[PDB]
Symmetry: D3
Subunit: 162 residues, 6 copies
């Protein structure tokens, strides 16, 4: 069973887009969203990963209640949101907390209610609609096998980068 640590940057329900500066460890405000939308899940990144674009792999964590920026949660992948925007491809691994029987019945993307996947998709498709020169050309969901393959590639890129 693949599992890993996710650092939360943005609690569910927030309109402030926080980001961890990976050089310093500091939490920074990127910006307050320009749209009347709020993050649909807790949002952050997988520790010890490196995506194709130089930053760690993004993670979305399903949780009963929001966390605080900077908090670590041990999690396991169930699928992956993929999108194409102004900086090209962007993937976000969808995760649930490990060692919690309340999530035991969610083994893969097929187990996650469609209305929840659709809400998360809608957020990422629209949240930058009022930001000039930002766009989304494509967005879809893939399952746990493909999420794990991407996690593995990013773990490999992390190790190769030093």
């Amino acid at each position: 069973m693949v599992q890993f640590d996710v650092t939360i940057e943005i609690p569910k329900g927030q309109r402030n887009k926080y980001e961890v500066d990976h050089k310093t460890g500091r939490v920074r405000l990127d910006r307050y969203l320009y749209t009347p939308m709020a993050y649909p899940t807790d949002y952050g990144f997988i520790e010890d990963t490196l995506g194709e674009d130089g930053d760690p792999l993004d993670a979305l964590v399903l949780l009963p209640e929001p966390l605080f920026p900077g908090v670590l949660v041990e999690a396991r992948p169930v699928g992956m949101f993929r999108m194409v925007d102004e900086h090209g491809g962007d993937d976000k691994v969808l995760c649930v907390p490990v060692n919690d029987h309340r999530w035991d019945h969610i083994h893969g993307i097929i187990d996650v209610p469609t209305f929840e996947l659709d809400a998360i998709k809608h957020f990422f498709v629209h949240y930058k609609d009022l930001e000039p020169g930002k766009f989304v050309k494509a967005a879809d969901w893939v399952g746990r096998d493909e999420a794990e393959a991407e996690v593995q590639r990013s773990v490999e890129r992390f190790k190769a980068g030093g």
Copy 2:
């Protein structure tokens, strides 16, 4: 100097869509939104008006902090949001609290920052995107003169 009472149905920042039952006065949950969006202003209706569709005229109230459902606020119009959806036309009057010097500089639609008007528009254009059979085909803003003309039509329509 047009002014009126607004009953708030939905506080700013809420994802629960409350509505007042106008035949009982009860506050009901209509639905929880299917989209990850939140009401961009306090939202409700103008007391003693009747729109083209039989409900009181909707109102959006700019405020420093959100209210509670059922609360009355005396307000004045600065403009009007108009849209066309699955039910046809819909107007929502944009308002600011009266006799509050902090809003005295806002006389009309040109005085409301574009980024704020664009955010309000974005909410109404997209908030029903995930509801089968619902849609928004057009949405725009008109000024205070047009808003007051609509309020006046709605007030007379109430009287008749």
Copy 3:
């Protein structure tokens, strides 16, 4: 397809125990809980029912976000919590909002996760532990058929 209106008294997550005075319609603070616990669901009563004890039938409503005291929500029964305390028997109907596809998979008590039923039970078993003379001697769950039978008895008891 049994459905009814629920008036919410107490939002999920609250430690203030509000109650509606059924002779006036006012919302009153009963008490702040003496235990470090919070209501596990939105909590209220079914409009136009009368229980065995003279009050409307209590209802627990599963919702994505809590409501406000006094708010009406149209709901359908999926099961019923039963308990015995210092006043004798008490039933609370477990409900989900109607005409909301997000709840369409929940048809009966077997469809509600055990961990959620256990949490609701734990609240009612313990929330009065620190009140002299109050106690809970037994608590259990029954299914949708039993819940609808109790709603029907309560509706007729209201009519009579």
Copy 4:
């Protein structure tokens, strides 16, 4: 053992100043405070009283957690805050919830910590500092005997 019902208008910690319209029962937004201050207690009025100025007698209720506007709480007086502002005299009865052992040690004004009385005073002395034409010239505390005498005058004034 004097006790009465208090309707809460403004929850503790709020910067929105709500008021009940006593001729309709509606809750209205009076104003958002112009000062960076927040109500130090739950704030409202005593039902079935009439002050010297024609409004019900104001009440401050000490509670572990704030309520919602319009909520009723059965309370007992422990003292009274008095002030003089632009409208002349104003009294606010300081109260604690009845039949709650957690407040049984609070019998009168001497039982309320000085730091808490000083904070409440500071709020009423300063909350209108940034409103032209408004002022507070004097403010003080009196004990439970004086509070009950004022409640009694207000109750009779209501009856007459």
Copy 5:
């Protein structure tokens, strides 16, 4: 007058059980409680202490309003909650902030209202009721002298461990 620094892990009113990883300094989500209960006080640990079980001594801090995970508060002990669970004995020192006249009248456990002690006891007796293989065999309160003796033992264990 004994005083010390408490790092808060869990704000009063929360149902998320956060914990500081003492090796790394990171705040982690342990778990969301399985019971409909919420922490009755701000909850954390005494810096520079070591309990018998290898972790710093736990602290409960009485405060007018909750803090954030990771925040330091200078505090003084007024008593100690003692319990016996599945890992044996567990003590939690009850504290108030120092240099604050609003707490000056609380010198010991006898000064703390009984209903508040009973609520805190009820939380620790019941909060793991729905977690299999977790239990509580005993729970009680002792006073300031005994709290200070335990604080001193833990300070001593801290120093002996390195």
Copy 6:
């Protein structure tokens, strides 16, 4: 255009007075306010500055929604609140976030609504009214040029201190 990093200590709306210990980086509770007031803006300090009194220069940041203690925001100065209290002079630089068109129209103190400046002044004039031996003798506002001059002096003092 002068810009700098502000670390937030106290979110707008709070009555807990948090402070960063500049030696350790830890966020500490200083105290809960004794007055029924709440911070009128997000409040903190400018990184890499040193005031005359030995601490970094204080900053007030205008924001649509409050942040969390410890969060960095890149900001630009629009004016400065000056006051004289029990420790003598104290200045707080008023700032807006950079690279955000929603604040583009605020170039200086003259652009900030008077009612907002008056509310911020009232807070600092009164928030210590119930703390014995604390007082305020003077308080006023100066504009962006004078804010930038003070920022520059504090940057210079920072560099001279090591």
